[PDB]
Design a binder for this molecule. Structure first.
Ligand code: FAD
Ligand code: FAD
Ligand code: M42
Ligand code: M42
Ligand code: ZN
Ligand code: ZN
Lengths: 230, 230
């Protein structure tokens, strides 16, 4: 109150553990009086590919297609495809953006990668030059809520997967920080599929409990040191 | 040399710098007498989304859709969508897989993320157990050939982007090593859009020239220490 939250959600199945985490987020933030909007990417059949269809009308150089250039020019000339601009409006209005997704290959599912690629365009999310703290979304908070197959033990420095902080870098630092977001600590729900039906309840409740005081949190220091150092 | 190479290529524009690096790879490996295949993802309109359309058989749990479970089962039964099995055949026969792409948000473009999500399914690329050094694609080589916006100086330990190896972790370790690939050293072509005509020519020829001796290289040690140091 008054805050707007966007949840960008990437799971195929409403009954999934990801689905429950998104639904608990909506319930709790709605209870607090927050304005809440969900981009359900799979349900939207959201387009992940960066193509020339992302620019309507005619191209600033139709001899050689350079996605970054064309989308930058399209943004400034209000000529982007409406799926993209619809998302940009939600992001522009949001105080907090939560990404809710299963880890796919130490990263976001391709549908959500496509949302980052196509929604966070130069002119909108950053300029060249125009980034990290010179980055256009400054003032906003972002938070990754990730589920994994691997256990917390696997996700340690000398575990097989390495520290979870290591896979966070391209998302938190290369993407969210670059665009100016302040980054709240990741929520990581380790290994729901190997249960139990009570540790699972416990993970959902912990996320619900944490959303209670989310506006009280300070952002992480989004540095090489936080991700890799001691 | 008597080897099969698959190049998975992710750029919209044939006259691009990526397009040039892909063609010099084809020209050079072809000159050597290697068998060469390119999956040009945008030209194929490759589907990046992990959906229930990827399975054509009776689902193992049609009440709650779990993509990993259903694709693992579909792989064993041969009920995967044929676009996926077409790619698996390329990978299965390849001795070396080269990925040629521009860096998008410290990672692969979503279209290529989708190829990794959908093509490297359980049963085919790994099993549980059967990953990392026991991955199912053991004996195969993989190499990332990546172009950036950011300069080499930006991609250093104390540059704004951090070391370039930091962003390689989810792709080299989390994906290729997990599937059992031995990983060759990345080719990184920094900031070609900024570069002079001659520096650009020199980056293309350094790749061509490296490929002349590719079959003699050893893989990297794909470990936390290699990627992060200390
Ligand atoms: C292409 C691909 C790549 C992957 N790469 C990685 C990787 O790099 N690293 C890694 O660690 N893992 C990886 N995984 C595994 C993936 O991250 C996990 O499968 C995923 O995060 C599981 O979350 P989910 O929502 O799908 O679980 P679900 O299967 O949907 O749920 C787990 C259980 O919770 C139940 N549930 C639903 N709601 C509730 C509720 N409120 N209370 C209690 N239980 C509930 C479900 O019924 C289910 O039994 C990959 C998977 C795929 C398909
Ligand atoms: C959505 C998005 C996200 C991005 N995220 C990142 C990121 O996280 N980090 C980062 O560093 N960068 C990022 N970038 C920038 C991106 O990586 C670069 O734009 C891309 O790597 C440049 O490669 P290219 O093939 O498109 O260059 P091009 O624009 O195609 O090439 C530059 C020049 O080389 C010329 N050329 C082509 N062939 C030859 C040849 N044979 N010899 C000499 N010159 C030739 C071309 O004509 C052109 O003039 C991002 C870009 C986008 C669009
Ligand atoms: C890289 C990785 C680490 C892990 O711990 N679990 C995984 C998994 C996958 C694919 C990849 C991983 O599918 C099911 O579970
Ligand atoms: C994250 C990042 C680092 C960088 O150095 N350059 C970038 C770039 C982009 C998008 C992101 C980046 O579009 C053009 O250039
Ligand atoms: Zn940062
Ligand atoms: Zn490794």
């Amino acid at each position: 109150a008054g805050k707007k939250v966007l949840i960008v959600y990437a799971h195929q199945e409403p009954k999934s553990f990801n689905g429950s985490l998104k639904n608990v987020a909506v319930d709790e933030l709605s209870r607090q009086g927050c304005t809440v909007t969900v981009s359900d990417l799979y349900a939207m059949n959201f387009e992940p590919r960066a193509t020339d269809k992302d620019i309507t009308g005619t191209l600033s150089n139709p001899e050689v297609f350079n996605y970054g250039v064309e989308t930058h020019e399209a943004y400034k000339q209000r000529s982007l495809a409406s799926d993209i601009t619809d998302e940009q409006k939600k992001v522009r209005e949001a105080d907090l953006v939560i990404f809710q997704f299963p880890l796919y290959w130490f990263s976001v599912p391709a549908i959500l990668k496509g949302w980052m690629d196509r929604v966070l365009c130069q002119g909108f999310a950053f300029d060249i030059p125009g980034f990290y703290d010179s980055g256009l979304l400054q003032g906003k908070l972002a938070l990754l809520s990730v589920t994994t197959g691997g256990t917390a033990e696997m996700y340690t420095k000398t575990g097989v997967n390495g520290d979870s902080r290591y896979f966070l870098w391209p998302l938190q630092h290369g993407t969210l920080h670059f665009c100016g977001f302040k980054v709240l600590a990741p929520q990581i729900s380790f290994a729901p599929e190997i249960a139990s039906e009570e540790e699972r309840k416990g993970m959902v409740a912990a996320w619900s409990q944490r959303l209670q005081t989310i506006w009280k949190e300070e952002p992480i220091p989004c540095t090489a040191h936080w991700h890799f150092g001691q």
